[PDB]
User: Fold Histone acetyltransferase KAT8 from Homo sapiens.
Amino acid sequence: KYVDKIHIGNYEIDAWYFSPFPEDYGKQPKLWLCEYCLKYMKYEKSYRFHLGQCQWRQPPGKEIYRKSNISVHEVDGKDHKIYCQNLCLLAKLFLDHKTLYFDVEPFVFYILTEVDRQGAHIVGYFSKEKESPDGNNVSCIMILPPYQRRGYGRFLIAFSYELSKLESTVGSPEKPLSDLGKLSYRSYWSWVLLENLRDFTLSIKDLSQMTSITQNDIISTLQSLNMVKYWKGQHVICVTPKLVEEHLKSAQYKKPPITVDSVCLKWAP
Ligand SMILES: O=C(NNS(=O)(=O)c1ccccc1F)c1ccccc1
Ligand SMILES: [Zn+2]
Assistant:
């Protein structure tokens, strides 16, 4: 009845949530997706015919980041409507709270790919409203299950703040976050803040300006690190250089990151 398994690239992936693909696409045992243009198909035969014909080998839009074989494409929902709609229906298989699939024009989509000789292979993405009334620098963020917990979510989170910095603005992901989303942002925030308190008298407003993390996300992060005191109605940073290093040395920050190299980012607001 609902779509419950997809084939994309060389992966078969079980669905986590309902996504409103048309009814007759549900009925099939599997839905088959072109990993490059994200067209969804009902049959292994139409899929293999499509694979032989389709000329795309990367996302549409502008490649705004390239370092070695990690690429980000910026895709405007108005310019590439069908691709963005396909991406949103794919995303909704793995996001409980996403509600927007068809009215994609207000959004820009940042698609993360990993490149080999065959083409640029989609790992995940984040959407962003062109005009956010609430200052959200991410709408939805999704990493395909076989790539989760492997560094790519940290990359996209970092990337979303590097855009916010180029915008001279603070930003926060739209709520609610998934369970993994919550843990991932808290861990990203903790690292960035701890490294700034090592590398540098920084105030909370100072840190917000340096990182584009909102003051509230800074404060909730420092509270979970027990690194803020409260005085006459104001949160104030309170931490020893040694306690910062204790946190940074811990086993949580020990996996080598895919880092966003701002030299390789090509973008203006
Ligand atoms: O895959 C995910 N997180 N684990 S991670 O990338 O190794 C990671 C490691 C350290 C800090 C933040 C991270 F994100 C993820 C999936 C969906 C939304 C957001 C993140
Ligand atoms: Zn295709």
